[PDB]
Design a protein around this ligand. Structure first.
Ligand code: NAG
Ligand code: NAG
Lengths: 37, 48
């Protein structure tokens, strides 16, 4: 595979990097995003 | 005062004097864009 490829070109002042276990016939996957405080 | 003061002065430390809107709690902005207070577009340079 071409890996990250054209998702991003450059990174400036990167302050975060959480790497853990991956998040993801048909399979329903539901997500709720909240940005509070 | 014994670590963060220089006779020349310390520029390694900066603060945001002007912003368009008050920040929401626990929010950090690292943008270096020009605060366009004037209707006329600063366009990346200082001016009136
Ligand atoms: C977040 O970005 C929006 C972009 O329109 C801006 O209007 C808003 O003021 C920013 N957040 C705050 C509350 O500073
Ligand atoms: C963040 O990155 C920009 C890239 O243009 C740089 O100018 C700026 O000095 C960096 N530092 C911060 C935390 O603003």
């Amino acid at each position: 595979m071409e890996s990250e490829f054209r998702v991003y070109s450059s990174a400036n002042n990167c302050t975060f990097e959480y790497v853990s276990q991956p998040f993801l016939f048909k399979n329903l996957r539901e997500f709720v995003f909240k940005n509070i405080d | 005062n014994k670590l963060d003061s220089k006779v020349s002065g310390n520029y390694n430390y900066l603060y945001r004097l002007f912003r368009k809107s008050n920040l929401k709690p626990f929010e950090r902005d690292i943008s270096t864009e020009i605060y366009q207070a004037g209707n006329k577009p600063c366009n990346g340079v200082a001016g009136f």
